[PDB]
Write a protein that holds these residues in place. Structure first.
Motif, PDB file in Angstrom:
ATOM      1  N   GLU A  51      -6.521  35.274  20.943  1.00 16.70           N
ATOM      2  CA  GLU A  51      -7.063  34.648  19.734  1.00 16.70           C
ATOM      3  C   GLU A  51      -6.000  34.552  18.639  1.00 16.70           C
ATOM      4  N   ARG A  52      -5.370  35.684  18.349  1.00 20.50           N
ATOM      5  CA  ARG A  52      -4.287  35.724  17.381  1.00 20.50           C
ATOM      6  C   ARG A  52      -3.030  36.282  18.039  1.00 20.50           C
ATOM      7  N   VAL A  53      -2.013  35.439  18.180  1.00 17.42           N
ATOM      8  CA  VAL A  53      -0.795  35.827  18.883  1.00 17.42           C
ATOM      9  C   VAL A  53       0.428  35.749  17.974  1.00 17.42           C
ATOM     10  N   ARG A  54       1.385  36.646  18.193  1.00 19.79           N
ATOM     11  CA  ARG A  54       2.621  36.644  17.421  1.00 19.79           C
ATOM     12  C   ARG A  54       3.816  36.961  18.311  1.00 19.79           C
ATOM     13  N   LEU A  55       4.805  36.075  18.305  1.00 15.19           N
ATOM     14  CA  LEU A  55       6.008  36.270  19.102  1.00 15.19           C
ATOM     15  C   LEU A  55       7.137  36.872  18.275  1.00 15.19           C
ATOM     16  N   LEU A  56       7.703  37.966  18.776  1.00 13.48           N
ATOM     17  CA  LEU A  56       8.863  38.592  18.155  1.00 13.48           C
ATOM     18  C   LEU A  56      10.039  38.652  19.120  1.00 13.48           C
ATOM     19  N   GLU A  57      11.016  37.777  18.909  1.00 15.91           N
ATOM     20  CA  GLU A  57      12.245  37.789  19.695  1.00 15.91           C
ATOM     21  C   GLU A  57      13.331  38.519  18.918  1.00 15.91           C
ATOM     22  N   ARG A  58      13.744  39.681  19.415  1.00 14.05           N
ATOM     23  CA  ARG A  58      14.675  40.525  18.676  1.00 14.05           C
ATOM     24  C   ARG A  58      15.925  40.883  19.470  1.00 14.05           C
ATOM     25  N   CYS A  59      17.068  40.817  18.797  1.00 12.86           N
ATOM     26  CA  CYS A  59      18.349  41.139  19.409  1.00 12.86           C
ATOM     27  C   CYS A  59      18.907  42.412  18.785  1.00 12.86           C
ATOM     28  N   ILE A  60      19.218  43.394  19.625  1.00 12.57           N
ATOM     29  CA  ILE A  60      19.730  44.670  19.142  1.00 12.57           C
ATOM     30  C   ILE A  60      21.109  44.978  19.717  1.00 12.57           C
ATOM     31  N   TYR A  61      22.062  45.254  18.833  1.00  9.22           N
ATOM     32  CA  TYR A  61      23.394  45.679  19.245  1.00  9.22           C
ATOM     33  C   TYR A  61      23.540  47.177  19.006  1.00  9.22           C
ATOM     34  N   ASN A  62      23.747  47.928  20.084  1.00  8.76           N
ATOM     35  CA  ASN A  62      23.773  49.387  20.021  1.00  8.76           C
ATOM     36  C   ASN A  62      22.420  49.956  19.594  1.00  8.76           C
ATOM     37  N   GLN A  63      22.320  50.375  18.336  1.00  6.59           N
ATOM     38  CA  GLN A  63      21.057  50.867  17.797  1.00  6.59           C
ATOM     39  C   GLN A  63      20.605  50.032  16.606  1.00  6.59           C
ATOM     40  N   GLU A  64      21.200  48.854  16.460  1.00  7.84           N
ATOM     41  CA  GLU A  64      20.974  48.032  15.282  1.00  7.84           C
ATOM     42  C   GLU A  64      20.456  46.637  15.620  1.00  7.84           C
ATOM     43  N   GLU A  65      19.218  46.363  15.219  1.00  9.36           N
ATOM     44  CA  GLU A  65      18.672  45.019  15.312  1.00  9.36           C
ATOM     45  C   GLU A  65      19.438  44.137  14.334  1.00  9.36           C
ATOM     46  N   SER A  66      19.977  43.029  14.830  1.00 12.02           N
ATOM     47  CA  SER A  66      20.848  42.185  14.021  1.00 12.02           C
ATOM     48  C   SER A  66      20.208  40.849  13.659  1.00 12.02           C
TER      49      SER A  66
END
Lengths: 190, 179, 14
Positions: free
Chosen positions: A22-37
């Motif tokens: 019904e309610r959808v949300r896409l989160l595309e995330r890129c992380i280098y080491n321990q840091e989302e950039s």
């Protein structure tokens, strides 16, 4: 020996579902080491640099509006599609818990002891455990391990009750879970 | 709320790659890079769904390239070794001589490189044991499970020896039955 | 129905 620096790169496509598809949300995330950039949020419609390191990529990708279009549509062609594919064996999975009650230690009566309510091998992780002394709920003296994930699509948890058991006392552990029509109860008589 | 996560990572210089799908913290499946095939966490899963494993390799390729671009852009800033929390427990209350499973739960660590061996009475065990790939975490660290089916007895002690760059020495987590 | 679809990673520059 092998003492080289290590460089890690992670990519996570997170489909969030609220009330099913019904309610959808896409989160595309890129992380280098321990840091989302850099991150794409379907609620925003474009990439955003989470750190300065990921700003080149945000600018670079946002400049291509057709890629942005495909990303926004992914909520349907990707998120909602996969939800339906696995729904049958994930969202609808229900495994009944095994409930066991036992004293932590072998104590003669009238001495402090922990009453362990073992609840293991259940799915999903949503669960409610309650202790009763002679029919009356007891909210104090309850120590819990919390929800424990086994790694094989099952959960376990130990809800313990601080007691000084008397001869004649009846202790009840009541368990509620999506996998049962009515609460599971297990008694232990002192 | 439910969450389905497509999780990929690539590690240098190790050249380790991983592609897996996750549901509310549990693995649906991962792709064996060497054999180029889908491996479902629960084999029953493969009867209701399929995945073109071959596509996972195309992704990992891009990931590897992106890692090296990132490595340079960061002026070669390496990852910090975060040692794991290790916990040993049974997947059910123990009853002497009654079949059970020891769970070595390795948690909150990075990079995703680890060495795990079970020890019974000081000696390695390989028969029956199994493991999971690295599970993703919201803090971007990793989670991992190791299993060892066994018959509980008052005559055996177990250890889960864990090696990780974040540790100064091998970490033994003891488990034994106590009468 | 009935195969899992995967999202594709975007490539960086230079």
């Amino acid at each position: 020996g092998d003492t080289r620096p290590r460089f890690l790169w992670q990519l996570k496509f997170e489909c969030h579902f609220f009330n099913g598809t019904e309610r959808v949300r896409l989160l595309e995330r890129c992380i280098y080491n321990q840091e989302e950039s850099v991150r794409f949020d379907s609620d925003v419609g474009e990439y955003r640099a989470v750190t300065e390191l990921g700003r080149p990529d945000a600018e670079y990708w946002n400049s291509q509006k057709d890629l942005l279009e495909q990303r926004r549509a992914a909520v349907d062609t990707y998120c909602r599609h996969n939800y339906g594919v696995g729904e049958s064996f994930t969202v609808q999975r229900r495994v009944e818990p095994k409930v066991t009650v036992y004293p932590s230690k072998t104590q003669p009566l009238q001495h402090h002891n922990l009453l362990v309510c073992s609840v293991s091998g259940f799915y999903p992780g949503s669960i409610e455990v309650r202790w009763f002394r002679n029919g009356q709920e007891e909210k104090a003296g309850v120590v819990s391990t919390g929800l424990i994930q086994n790694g094989d699509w099952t959960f376990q948890t130990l809800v313990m009750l601080e007691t000084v058991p008397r001869s004649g006392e009846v202790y009840t552990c009541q368990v509620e879970h999506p996998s049962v029509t009515s609460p599971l109860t297990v008694e232990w008589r002192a | 709320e439910h969450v389905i996560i497509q999780a990929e990572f690539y590690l240098n210089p190790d050249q380790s790659g991983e592609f897996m799908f996750d549901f509310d913290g549990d693995e649906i499946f991962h792709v064996d890079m060497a054999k180029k095939e889908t491996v479902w966490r629960l084999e029953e899963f493969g009867r209701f769904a399929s995945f073109e494993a071959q596509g996972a390799l195309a992704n990992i390729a891009v990931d590897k390239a992106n890692l090296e671009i990132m490595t340079k852009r960061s002026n070669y800033t390496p990852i910090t070794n975060v040692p794991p929390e290790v916990t040993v427990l049974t997947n059910s209350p123990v009853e002497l001589r009654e079949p059970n499973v020891l769970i070595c739960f390795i948690d909150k660590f990075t990079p995703p490189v680890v060495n795990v061996t079970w020890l019974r009475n000081g000696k390695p065990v390989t028969t029956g044991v199994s493991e999971t790939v690295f599970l993703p975490r919201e803090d971007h660290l990793f989670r991992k499970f190791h299993y060892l089916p066994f018959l509980p007895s008052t005559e055996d002690v177990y250890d889960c020896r864990v090696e990780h760059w974040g540790l100064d020495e091998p970490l033994l987590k003891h488990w034994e039955f106590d009468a | 129905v009935s195969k899992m679809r995967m999202a594709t990673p975007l490539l960086m520059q230079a």
